[PDB]
Amino acid sequence: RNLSALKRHRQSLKRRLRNKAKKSAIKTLSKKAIQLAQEGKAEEALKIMRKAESLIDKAAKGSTLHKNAAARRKSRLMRKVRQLLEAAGAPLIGGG
Amino acid sequence: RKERVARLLRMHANHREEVEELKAGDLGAVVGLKETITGDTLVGEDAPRVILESIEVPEPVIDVAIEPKTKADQEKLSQALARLAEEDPTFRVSTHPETGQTIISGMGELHLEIIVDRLKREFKVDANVGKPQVAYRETITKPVDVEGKFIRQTGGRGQYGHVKIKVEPLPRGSGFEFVNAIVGGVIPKEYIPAVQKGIEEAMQSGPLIGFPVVDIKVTLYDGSYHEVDSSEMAFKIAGSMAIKEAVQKGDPVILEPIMRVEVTTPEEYMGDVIGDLNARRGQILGMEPRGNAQVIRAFVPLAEMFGYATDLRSKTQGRGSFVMFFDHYQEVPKQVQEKLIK
Amino acid sequence: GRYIGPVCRLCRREGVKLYLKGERCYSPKCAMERRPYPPGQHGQKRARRPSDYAVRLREKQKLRRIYGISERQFRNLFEEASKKKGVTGSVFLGLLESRLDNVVYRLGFAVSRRQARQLVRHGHITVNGRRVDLPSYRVRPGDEIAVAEKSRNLELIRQNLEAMKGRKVGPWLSLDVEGMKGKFLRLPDREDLALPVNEQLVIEFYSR
RNA sequence: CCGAGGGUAGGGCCCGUGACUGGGGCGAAGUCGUAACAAGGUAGCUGUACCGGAAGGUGCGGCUGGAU
RNA sequence: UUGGAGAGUUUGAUCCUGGCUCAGGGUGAACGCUGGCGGCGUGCCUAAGACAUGCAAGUCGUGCGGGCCGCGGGUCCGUGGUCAGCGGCGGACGGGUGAGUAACGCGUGGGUGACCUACCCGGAAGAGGGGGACAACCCGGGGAAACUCGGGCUAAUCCCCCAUGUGGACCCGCCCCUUGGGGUGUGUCCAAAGGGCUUUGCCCGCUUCCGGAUGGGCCCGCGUCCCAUCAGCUAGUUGGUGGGGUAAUGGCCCACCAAGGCGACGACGGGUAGCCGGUCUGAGAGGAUGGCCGGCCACAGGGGCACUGAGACACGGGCCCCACUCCUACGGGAGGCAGCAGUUAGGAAUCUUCCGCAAUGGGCGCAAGCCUGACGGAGCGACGCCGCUUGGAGGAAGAAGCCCUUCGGGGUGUAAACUCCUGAACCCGGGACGAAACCCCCGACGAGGGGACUGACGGUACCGGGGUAAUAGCGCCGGCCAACUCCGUGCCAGCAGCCGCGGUAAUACGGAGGGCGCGAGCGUUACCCGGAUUCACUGGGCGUAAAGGGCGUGUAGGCGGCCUGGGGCGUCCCAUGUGAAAGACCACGGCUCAACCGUGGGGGAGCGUGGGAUACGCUCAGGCUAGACGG
């Protein structure tokens, strides 16, 4: 008939909302940067890609992501973008 | 068996009440008693493990006297029904004061047919009985007050008993009330248990028909004594000379025991059963259906309830039945009153 | 609890003299001195040959009723020496003789073991200072049984120390009269004691 | 998209039960006859096939755990 | 070498097979008769049926700002409480049950170069600037309630951005290793928070990074019950590739290609079942068994599900569905006792709606303290075990009474009465251990001394003093099997575990006298093992007793001659790691003994690793003719 479990439940909802936020922008930008990586659009795909990498590690700082999760998402994105830009080169600018 | 008294509860008009303690004399509800039914005796853990019999009245209404015939096997009779006293405690076995004989009380014909049968065929018992069962009782109408002087002081061997009691009418079914109302101590302290034995021994016989008297109230209040002469066998007969005479003086009037019957006669033989039930001193109470068929219920005195065993056969062609149970007491009309005394 | 029943029936049923009434036994007023046949309606009848089980049965009870001990404790003492090393049919009697109430009987402090028990149970016996009211107590070698100070002034232990001015104790026991104290020396041998009990038959029975 | 469950359809196994029925067991002073144990009065047993109120008989082949 | 017993019964009698039955020990027991005390245990096995009420998880004012209150006044501040709210930390432990599961679920030994770990511990580094919101609060609609909704103001250890990179992470190089292990170079990306006191000082915090410690995940070899009257099973099914997802491997999930995977060494299917430590029986072997206590798993009314998070797909958190129940002001809304007690039903049966946080342990905290049905105690029940009491001594050639009797006597029986003696209980006084740590003082909030406070059990145990003879019942008494007569009964009434008793002399039935056996217990029923060598490995059989297949051929399968060698799989030896604790074993010791409890010793089996031996079995090679085939 009481107990701060509802207090606890109240907070978990706030964390659920903030967590579901970052992950969406992660996907939104990671997917976009891979699209322009197939386009190439070489520079225009690293710009977005850096912003993604930041969000990968910005979430991992808290409870939104574990470090391995960051390490994983960072590994794939750099990989799947590379092989895309192997169709027509031009590595500019920085990023790898 | 033991049981756990836990919650002690009381009930109110609007809600419930849990309390901590219940005092003597009071009543209430107690939660936790698992295997307890009504009419059960509950005492404390280390307390006198006693039955509260309390729920009184057995009560014998049929008197069947038995004769031990001849002669040396009389002590097996008193030992035969002794095996049934601790086995069946509803009927009684008490000898008659006047006339002198054992009368085996009981509850009914079937109750005092199986006692007669089993004894004759399991215990031999050299005996053969009557016997009616009219077992009348007698009582008074107005309060009495007499004395019982039992004095013999013309020699030098005891005998001095002076006992004055007040015998007043107590409602029918109430029983016997004895109280000690001595002012100071005009009678010694030891001769109170023994004056009561002359009051109750005289009450074993009647003045009119010689049958026990009930529904009175003896109040011992005064009486003199002599220090050396008075004996414990001197105050007893002093309490009998004042009981055979108080109840004999103050308006002694008669009474009897009535019974209630429920006859399950087919409706075709109702008027035959009805008209005769009333000529059997009957006061009808109503009829109801049952096996279709129909049941009829009235109040009939036991005296006019002998032929009715086989009379329901004569009427209903053998299609009716009954049960019959005792009920209460009353005052027979002066037509049968003034003629029973013979 | 314990037996508390008549005891001269026992010596009759056994066919032996199980000294248990104490002083009364030595006198010719003893039941056995008078009636040797077992009790009951058919005592004087010429006995019929017992079976081997009857033989071993009548041996086991003979031992028990000498010490006065319930079957449980009697068997547990038996089942103890068996679970132990060495010969069981010996250390059993030892553990029987290591009982405090039995030691009180051999140190003269009592006329009979039946009597010694009460004296133990009534706190009138202390061992090594510690007041010990336990008859089931088991005594080890290296101990000094004694009567309590607040129990030295009794008109009954006197007459039993005064009887023990003359009599001598066994090999495995020490006594100190006037000073009313004892001393447990060692655990006995089957030659130290010679109870009328063939101890083999007691072990021969419990195997069944 | 998947999804608890709901519903439609069709199946499999198990348990309880059913008018009626088929034999089986325990009984015992019966009705019926008297097959096996003696060559049991037709030597017995046997697989089979047929028939017979019933045990059983009979045909074919087999076995001796069949007697002289 | 510490360990092993059999009986009765098929016949006129014998011997055998062989079934039947009994003696023994055991329980979470229960039922009958009886029932005094203490201790330590233990007590819904049936309905994982439903549950009234209470209690079972919470804490920090030394993280933030408010409503009120007391306190010192100039309604200003300060401060102390207090109430929720925001924000931490815990709620994932601790407690219960035995439903489900025949499975890596458990047990046992490993593997992770395929992984994670909060608080704690160690080392290295760092804490500089900005920005923002939602509750409380006032204002407002609705409701019986549950209470929700809307608008605006605002604080931080709440959130966001920039800087800093000792480091870390990721792409591809490049180096040593070898499964994704360790570096390094370039590009890219990321840290943060403050509070408190005595103050250029500590203290509790915070941040990224490497290490330990502990706790796991995952995977593997071996072990793990009944039915073959279950014989064939399977489309994510078996394998590849690509990707998704996860801390991480993986058909785990998804698209596609391939045609595979398992099975008489029991697949598939059906029945039952939580598994081990152990417990009990047992000469051992083996059998049965899993309450209590410790370890693991599973479930939290039946289900599906994700969220928060270090950790749950969460017993007393949330969402949905279903069966059930209840509240109501009928508009609607609430609940989950296989937590601790308790109720109800079912049943042969299983308990107090108790006390305490004094100890122990846990959570939060600087500390004081606060929470704790974990835990420590108390209550009930002879349920179990263990100790104890109902008295000890004297006391007749033997009271009475009852029983038997050749009427001479015998039996109960030293038993009682009786004399002496002690003193269970009760009464009186004293009064525990468990309790010394946290903390206050010195020192340095360290080390080391010194100091105070606190006891549920409990005025209990125990100690002192006084002190009375103070409960005995049950089963048997034909043979097994110990213990005998009398009367009643007349194939009746009844006993009976087996063989069998009772038809007018019943040691067998019922009673009595007498006797045997146990004792606060004794008998019974139910079940496990034993005897049962009667499923026979130890350790049985098959001519007539139960049992050779009707008879051949041959598949798998089991088994295999002589000589020498190579390997070393079985096998054997040593060493080592492992075999938790508890128990059991032996020793000693603590509660007056014991039961119970503690200290210490001692191992095994089996498995891991390393070493060795080479007979026997195996295996690769060589060789012989005695088996077998053939001319």
Ligand code: SF4
């Ligand atoms: S008195 Fe005699 S017969 Fe009786 S117990 Fe003592 S020694 Fe035995």
Ligand SMILES: [Mg+2]
């Ligand atoms: Mg709730």
Ligand SMILES: [Mg+2]
């Ligand atoms: Mg709610």
Ligand SMILES: [Mg+2]
């Ligand atoms: Mg909280």
Ligand SMILES: [Mg+2]
């Ligand atoms: Mg989108």
Ligand SMILES: [Mg+2]
């Ligand atoms: Mg490549």
Ligand SMILES: [Mg+2]
């Ligand atoms: Mg009419």
Ligand SMILES: [Mg+2]
């Ligand atoms: Mg004698």
Ligand SMILES: [Mg+2]
């Ligand atoms: Mg031994």
Ligand SMILES: [Mg+2]
């Ligand atoms: Mg032994």
Ligand SMILES: [Mg+2]
């Ligand atoms: Mg004294």
Ligand SMILES: [Mg+2]
């Ligand atoms: Mg004394």
Ligand SMILES: [Mg+2]
């Ligand atoms: Mg034995």
Ligand SMILES: [Mg+2]
């Ligand atoms: Mg579906």
Ligand SMILES: [Mg+2]
């Ligand atoms: Mg549905």
Ligand SMILES: [Mg+2]
């Ligand atoms: Mg469906």
